């Protein structure tokens, strides 16, 4: 299962 | 940027016997970039129905895919694999071995 | 053996032509399970695997969403990387990502990890500790710095200690009939001329489960490792996985050699000559 979270470099 | 050119094996997924059904398999592995080109050849000719795995990649980051399609081995009719790719200046094409 | 789930990100930007490709693809240990692919005009996470059907009806569509929102932020981390490393609008690039998590055959949590690459180098990844980062260069650093203010790594961490392991146990259950069932080898050797004195034996492993296996050749019992050619494990293109090792040597001196296979599913080791 994935989750969100918001991975923004 | 990196770019690691691919390693391509082109094998049987059952052991080769004339008129028996199978699956020729084109495994092109170690790559990177991810763009690429995979032909199935039947006598040098593009085979039509052929089907790939998802993009997938290894703990050093390189992808690999499977490509595939259904045939049935004969004695006289010979199988390659035909790859392209940014690393390559021109097509790699890998005959199949049913010895390897 | 151990236990794995893991999770493979790819993202590939394509100036001139559009927005950015985005793949996701599962596994548990070496079982594909879910896939998700934006070239699609309605695009879905998708089974891989048949016991995938044991799922909640809503499972697809809230995996969907998270794919589409995990999506977005790699188009934007496309855009980020240009800036961060003073590169033109004009090629195409990748962003990739995998983590995981690990358990011991009893369902035990003892690794997880988390990495992040741009075009195919290493670019950020969490630290053993599951509590630090490691930028790989200083374009990266900027986003060591904005992380650690953050708190990434708790986040991170909460997930692959926790909701990561507590799936690959229901997936395990789910898929136990196929995942926990090894399938042992069918090993054969075959015998080519090599030169005018020489011959090539080969030891053909197929039709396996899981991946890993010894095949190895001996000399009067003890280990040629040296003068062994030994092809990658490949896929079967069923699920199942084939590997074959070869040898040279003298032509009539065949019986001197013998082949070992050990894979998880035999009940003993098979050896087998000419």
């Not at chain 2, 092109?28 to 998802?54: Q, T």
């Not at chain 2, 895919?65 to 035909?82: G, M, V």
């Not at chain 3, 977005?72 to 195409?92: H, I, K, P, W």
Request: glycine share 6%; proline share 5%; net charge negative.
């Amino acid at each position: 299962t994935l989750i969100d979270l918001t991975e923004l470099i | 940027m990196i770019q690691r050119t691919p390693k391509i094996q082109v094998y049987s997924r059952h052991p080769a016997e004339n008129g028996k059904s199978n699956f020729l398999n084109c495994y092109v592995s170690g790559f990177h970039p991810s763009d690429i080109e995979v032909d199935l050849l039947k006598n040098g000719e593009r085979i039509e129905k052929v089907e790939h795995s998802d993009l997938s990649f290894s703990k050093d980051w390189s992808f690999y895919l499977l490509y595939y399609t259904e045939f049935t081995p004969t004695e006289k009719d010979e199988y390659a694999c035909r790859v392209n790719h940014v690393t390559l200046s021109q097509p790699k094409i890998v005959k199949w071995d049913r010895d390897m | 053996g151990s236990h794995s789930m893991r999770y493979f990100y790819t993202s590939v930007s394509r100036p001139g032509l559009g927005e950015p490709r985005f793949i996701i693809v599962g596994y548990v240990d070496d079982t594909q399970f879910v896939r998700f692919d934006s070239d699609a005009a309605s695009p879905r996470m998708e089974q891989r695997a048949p016991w995938m059907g044991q799922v909640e009806p809503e499972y697809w569509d809230q995996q969907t969403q998270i794919a589409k929102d995990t999506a977005q932020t790699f188009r934007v981390n496309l855009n980020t990387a240009l800036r961060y490393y003073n590169q033109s609008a004009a090629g195409s690039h990748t962003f990739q990502t995998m983590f995981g998590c690990e358990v011991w055959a009893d369902g035990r949590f003892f690794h997880g990890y988390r990495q992040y690459a741009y075009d195919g180098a290493d670019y950020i990844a969490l630290n053993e500790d599951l509590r630090s980062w490691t930028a790989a260069d200083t374009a990266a650093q900027n986003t060591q710095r904005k992380w650690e203010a953050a708190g990434e790594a708790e986040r991170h961490r909460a997930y692959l200690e926790r909701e990561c392991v507590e799936w690959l146990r229901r997936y395990l259950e789910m898929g136990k009939e196929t995942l926990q069932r090894a399938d042992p080898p069918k090993a054969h050797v075959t015998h080519h001329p090599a030169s005018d004195r020489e011959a090539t034996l080969r030891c053909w492993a197929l039709g396996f489960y899981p991946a890993e296996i010894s095949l190895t050749w001996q000399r009067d019992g003890e280990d040629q490792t040296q003068d062994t050619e030994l092809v990658e494990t490949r896929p079967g293109g069923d699920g199942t996985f084939q590997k074959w090792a070869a040898v040279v040597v003298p032509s009539g001196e065949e019986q001197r050699y013998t082949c070992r296979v050990q894979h998880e599913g035999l009940p003993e080791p098979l050896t087998l000559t000419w």
